[PDB]
Symmetry: D2
Subunit: 187 residues, 4 copies
């Protein structure tokens, strides 16, 4: 059984990004032998999050869940041509090579199609510094497009991205450290 964790980083209530992540999570679970959690970073304790205070039980649980995941869905709205500070604050408290062995699917929504590359240029290098095993294609959606109530061509791309994410999940213990630069120094 794969353990899939979704992490969404909008600081606003009624997040369309969160709906996108939830959609992706349900899609993967309907087609694989998986369990899931959805970490809404906005629902973590702000003081504990910014201070990396792992005596906060809910924050510690979120971190542990991410560390135990076989795949991560990482979703953010685009703020100022990049990922949210809220999402990055969460990534900052994971251990150094937290993503070793893991697959990942980067998702975003934005107000403008001008900022599609924020995922590939901004978020992707961050995940690769955490030793991630396999980050599949990014998917970005413009605000308006969404309502699976979305345009056909857009829906095909999203579904293909989520399919690829699911196909890239690994059971095998041999892959657990892949992505780490020095796999015998743990992972």
């Amino acid at each position: 059984t794969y353990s899939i964790v979704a992490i969404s980083g909008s600081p606003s209530r009624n997040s369309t990004t969160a709906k996108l992540a939830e959609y992706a999570l349900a899609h993967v679970l309907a087609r694989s032998d998986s369990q899931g959690r959805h970490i809404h970073v906005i629902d973590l304790d702000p003081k504990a999050l910014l201070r990396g205070d792992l005596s906060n039980a809910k924050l510690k649980e979120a971190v542990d869940a991410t560390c135990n995941a076989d795949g991560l869905i990482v979703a953010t709205p685009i703020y100022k041509a990049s990922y949210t500070g809220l999402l990055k604050a969460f990534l900052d408290i994971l251990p150094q090579f937290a993503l070793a062995g893991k697959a990942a699917l980067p998702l975003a929504t934005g107000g403008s199609p001008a900022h599609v590359l924020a995922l590939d240029y901004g978020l992707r290098p961050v995940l690769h510094s955490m030793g991630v095993r396999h980050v599949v294609q990014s998917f970005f959606m413009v605000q308006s497009q969404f309502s699976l109530a979305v345009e056909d061509d857009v829906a095909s791309q999203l579904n293909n991205a989520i399919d690829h994410f699911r196909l890239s999940l690994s059971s095998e213990p041999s892959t657990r450290h892949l992505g780490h630069p020095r796999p015998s120094l743990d992972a």
Copy 2:
């Protein structure tokens, strides 16, 4: 009189990044007709910061100060090959073209020299989405180097960067909107 604002984003106490920003701020003030403030993002109210709650007076004051600055010193440690979530959380609550008319100096410290480009590839595009007028060269310092108790060649580069920052400050009202894509839609 120029108004200079420094913003430092380490979430850790006893921040060397903060010492770097303070050094840069003092350097500029000793050589120009300027006033300064140093916003330590860690000292802002975490809940209010993450929620963009401007009824918090100290947060509102920080935002206003940034909006009134002629120059910004933006300093962060490198976390996960990029700027901190803490710093980005602060940038996220500034208005859309908050940096129109302004000069900026990007500063960072990091544990490894491998991540020098995090400023130019990560932070610089963020400032440019906020309509910044003039971002001078980045300066990055490796942890060890610091203690102006720092290596000669390193010190020359830092000082040149801060000099350039100071020389790039503008008094003229005509430059107030430069950097904004549509300067008559305010700034």
Copy 3:
């Protein structure tokens, strides 16, 4: 008198990018005391360019012209979510801190609005490694938009970008080395 040099990097004949650069060059020259050249990288000798062979007179002249410019207009179509290899091949043969003291205006055309950030994330850091003094806002145009036969809002942004470029040009000998990390090691 300012010396302005435009560099356009499409490898295709009938380049709309070239027309954009020529437009920007004429705009600056009509409003400042300036001379101009337009280097079409496609018109340089391919063997000499790829080998950095400065015994080719036309290639050497192009390099010298760039080194003597007060401002550079650097224009490229977007290929594979970045600047062209053709343009980069030219930038690769300039000396290490070739752009010290200079202003620069990054321009691009692309088939899709999805790749606007290729300038800020891809080209801007390259110019900053060459010690550039002042790179103003990027301007990107989608293929269709062009024909000053272009949409009003788009035209305003382009013109504002070119205005800012012109305003940022410096006469003063004191600015000649600004941008260089060690200005007394020449520039």
Copy 4:
């Protein structure tokens, strides 16, 4: 049998980058059922390369070989904080989603450790615009380090990167289009 293609992009003779790519290619071939080619972009016809002239037989063969590869080793020296124009010129003539279904290993050498992130921030997004299936961790080496005559810790990282590359190769026809946004529009 996997078909592995190495592409090295230094424009200088006696390229250490080429030696790195050749080393990686031999490493993969010694541990998997594979054939290999090494495309030295410098050895392609400069005029034909810059013009994308596929009536040049050697250029056409290189492009076809890349399109038929199950894995690509893409190696470049760092020039001006990014990949070479020479390498990018070659990538520019591949079809739009040329890398669909493929694994890739990004390699670089550079004079300074300051530019490690040029791979993750610069090259990685380019490959992802070509629909690549799986790009494993980057490896960067500083000039001095090289002579497998290299430092132990450095050698471990390189070998782990190449191991991961080899493990990520896919035989299965089902993976042939993975990475493409619309896999039924070919690949």
